[PDB]
């Protein structure tokens, strides 16, 4: 790789994020603020997405 090269021959850095978006228990999450847990009412819920 040289600084003079045409763009198709210039270096690019690549990062590929593979998600194990499985039914398995989570350890990487978005910054979502959790609530207290309501029971015995009809409610909306969001457990780990």
């Amino acid at each position: 790789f040289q600084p003079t090269y045409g763009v198709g021959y210039q270096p690019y850095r690549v990062v590929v994020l593979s998600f194990e978006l499985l039914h398995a228990p989570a350890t990487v999450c978005g910054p979502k603020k959790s609530t207290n847990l309501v029971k015995n009412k009809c409610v909306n819920f969001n457990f780990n997405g």
């Binding site: 499985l22 039914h23 398995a24 228990p25």
Partner: peptide, 24 residues
């Protein structure tokens, strides 16, 4: 040497709970 496996070697196919059900 050799021997018969019978019904050995089954494992849970995915990390989901299921109960009172037959799953293919």
């Amino acid at each position: 040497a050799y021997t018969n496996s019978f019904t050995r070697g089954v494992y849970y196919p995915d990390k989901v709970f299921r109960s009172s059900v037959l799953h293919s």
